[PDB]
């Protein structure tokens, strides 16, 4: 976790080291409870001793409310009072062992322990490697959602104004300006952002600790013996729920200006304002503006730091902006001002579906319509580009919709008649729709995705709001007929027929379950709908989407969310995308299966029996296919216990190419840090490895008609 005993008020993440771990755990062996009872016993083993301390740090608070006292030389007891700072008092020595431990770092330390305590209690899945054999400190951007670097002015001594702000009360309080400045930037950043963020870390890049014997103090190249650092980097763990709020609420209005309101007005200055709302409350709040290129977090920190720290500071985080720009900008009103987290376009498409959804019920048909289940990509907020009215050039314009009628014994028993009967139902639906609702336009199309079923006909509806829907009929007799085909098929042909079934259930049966759970899960994971789209965008640039089914990309991209360990839940566009890259780079799909718990953040969680059952499936498959030519990626879940539904038919070269791209990308990141040049390389295709390359151009520009 990148935790050390080194100083933290300087900026480095640490302050909790082996000695603090050892001293703490020693105290627990002597007590630690509110009633001074032993929480750890000398008879405990290593697992139990480690479990208790991790459990202890997770739930009992040592900084704000509550603190510990012990006697090194007397049972250790937990006090409810807190000193507002990480405190581990020693009455025998009168020494607080957590003095080096910063408040900001303490919350992160608490989060890690509690987050790990969950895996320690986990029984379904082994977690030994993640807890212990995985370094999360290699990349800050993977470990932190947002990173801003701030270039202080006059950096061979800091400007007189900033040096003057240091003040004598602060030399006595903070011995070094670095300690003071870190506190200054933290407090304003914490106060400014507030609930928008969970955790903040201030790192002083290029801080040295060793100097030659010939010198009295450390010498920094930019410091000039004045300040031992190059620049300050502000790292955050953002809160997706309230990151993008337009308005920052503040203390309520009153007859007499209250202290909390007073600091609010002083802190924000002109940006402060007193506003009323629909509910009728009068409160001091400041309003910001959403942008499709950068989050509200970038603007607030820029203004806050400049006003209070120094008006000459330069704040820049171009990496996120470049990531934001790569997301296709929809051709809707106020597209630029729209935030990346807004799903209004998807909802509007759903509303249009609802209007049609009503019409088809009220239409009289020989068989009562049972249920219409939308399964299109947009319905789960995964479409690469947001839906746009009348932008029919988009490949995803027509969203698949499943129509199912009441169970009847009159369905044809032979396949070819069955769909032709289904087409008859669609034909009548079109006629009545054309007559009763002329504003809707419709036409028929040929679907051949399912192999050898050349007669499935789909009805395409052009909605007046400007959206397209594709309707296909599902019949209960349909699925048994495919089973009938497999049974009667020749032994040599049976492997071919089961593949035909595999695609059928992928489109008709499993697709319903897929859209349902992803849609509901997407609400909790705010950044899922963006990151998946960039992931598909990244695949398209390297010509991988053609062989990778859209579902498989989604399941790979949700792994960092349902299984964020050892990392946290991503709350940034950059953090989510690169973590998907990290997983693919290190994924040994030949020996390691990928299985996901499609559940909301802490039922439907996989149990031991189900977990082992899926594991046996992987071993049996790999026994038949050890080298993994026939199957490469094993993606399974509650919806997919077989594990081969969405990953079958992928050529091995594309599977290897996918992993090869991910590995090299990570290698570039290690060699060269995230910057404008690198990110451009990530998203540009080499195109040289291919044996032959053919250039094609369309007669007209399709970007405008794609709603981009």
């Amino acid at each position: 976790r990148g935790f050390s005993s080194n100083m933290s008020h300087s900026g480095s993440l640490g302050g909790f080291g082996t000695f603090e771990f050892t001293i703490l755990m020693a105290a627990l062996l002597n007590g630690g409870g509110i009633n001074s009872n032993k929480i750890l016993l000398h008879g405990f083993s290593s697992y139990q001793l480690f479990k208790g301390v991790i459990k202890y740090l997770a739930t009992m608070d040592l900084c704000h409310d509550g603190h510990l006292q012990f006697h090194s030389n007397p049972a250790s007891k937990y006090i409810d009072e807190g000193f507002q700072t990480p405190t581990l008092f020693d009455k025998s020595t009168k020494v607080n062992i957590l003095t080096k431990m910063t408040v900001s770092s303490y919350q992160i330390l608490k989060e890690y322990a509690g987050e790990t305590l969950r895996m320690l209690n986990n029984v379904v899945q082994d977690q030994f490697s993640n807890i212990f054999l995985t370094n999360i400190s290699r990349f800050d951007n993977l470990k932190y959602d947002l990173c801003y670097d701030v270039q202080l002015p006059l950096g061979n001594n800091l400007e007189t104004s900033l040096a003057a702000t240091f003040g004598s009360m602060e030399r006595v309080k903070f011995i070094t300006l670095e300690n003071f400045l870190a506190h200054k930037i933290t407090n304003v950043a914490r106060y400014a952002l507030g609930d928008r963020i969970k955790y903040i870390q201030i790192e002083m890049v290029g801080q040295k600790s060793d100097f030659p014997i010939t010198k009295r103090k450390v010498y920094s190249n930019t410091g000039g013996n004045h300040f031992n650092f190059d620049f300050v980097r502000v790292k955050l763990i953002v809160n997706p729920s309230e990151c993008d709020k337009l308005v920052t609420k503040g203390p309520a209005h009153s007859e007499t200006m209250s202290t909390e309101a007073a600091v609010f007005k002083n802190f924000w200055g002109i940006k402060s304002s007193l506003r009323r709302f629909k509910d009728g409350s009068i409160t001091h709040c400041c309003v910001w503006s959403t942008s499709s290129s950068e989050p509200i977090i970038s603007s607030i920190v820029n203004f806050a730091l400049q006003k209070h720290v120094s008006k000459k500071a330069q704040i820049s985080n171009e990496t996120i902006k470049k990531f934001h720009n790569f997301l296709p900008l929809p051709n809707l009103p106020s597209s630029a001002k729209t935030s990346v987290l807004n799903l209004s376009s998807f909802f509007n498409l759903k509303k249009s579906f609802d209007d049609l959804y009503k019409i088809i019920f009220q239409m009289k048909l020989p068989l009562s319509v049972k249920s219409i289940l939308p399964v299109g990509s947009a319905f789960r907020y995964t479409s690469l580009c947001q839906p746009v009215p009348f932008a029919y050039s988009d490949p995803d314009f027509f969203q698949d919709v499943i129509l199912e009628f009441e169970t009847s014994p009159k369905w044809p028993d032979e396949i070819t008649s069955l769909e032709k009967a289904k087409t008859a139902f669609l034909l009548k639906i079109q006629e009545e729709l054309s007559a009763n609702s002329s504003t809707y336009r419709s036409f028929f199309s040929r679907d051949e995705s399912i192999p050898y079923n050349l007669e499935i006909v789909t009805l395409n509806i052009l909605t007046p709001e400007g959206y397209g829907f594709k309707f296909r009929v599902l019949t209960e007799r349909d699925e048994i007929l495919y089973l009938r085909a497999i049974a009667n098929a020749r032994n040599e042909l049976k492997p071919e027929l089961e593949a035909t079934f595999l695609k059928f259930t992928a489109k008709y049966l499993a697709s319903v379950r897929h859209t349902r759970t992803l849609e509901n899960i997407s609400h909790s994971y705010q950044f899922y709908s963006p990151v998946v789209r960039l992931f598909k965008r990244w695949l398209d640039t390297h010509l991988l989407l053609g062989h990778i089914t859209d579902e498989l990309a989604e399941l790979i991209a949700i792994k960092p969310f349902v299984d964020p360990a050892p990392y946290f839940i991503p709350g940034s566009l950059e953090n989510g995308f690169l973590k998907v890259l990290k997983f693919i780079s290190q994924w040994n799909w030949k020996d390691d299966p990928l299985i996901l718990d499609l559940v909301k953040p802490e039922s439907e969680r996989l149990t031991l029996a189900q977990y082992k059952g899926i594991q046996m499936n992987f071993t049996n498959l790999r026994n038949s296919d050890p080298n993994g030519t026939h199957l490469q990626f094993f993606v399974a879940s509650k919806n997919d216990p077989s594990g081969i539904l969405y990953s079958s038919g992928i050529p091995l070269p594309i599977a290897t190419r996918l992993t090869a791209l991910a590995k090299v990308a990570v290698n570039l990141l290690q060699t060269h840090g995230l910057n404008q040049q690198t990110i451009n390389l990530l998203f540009t295709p080499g195109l040289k490895d291919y044996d032959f390359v053919v250039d094609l151009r369309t007669p007209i520009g399709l970007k405008s008609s794609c709603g981009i």
Partner: peptide, 25 residues
Amino acid sequence: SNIFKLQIDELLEQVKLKQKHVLKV
């Protein structure tokens, strides 16, 4: 738990320092 316990023992011996260098220092 037994699997976890054996996993601990494997980790410890891997990171166990070589006693020869202890004499050297």
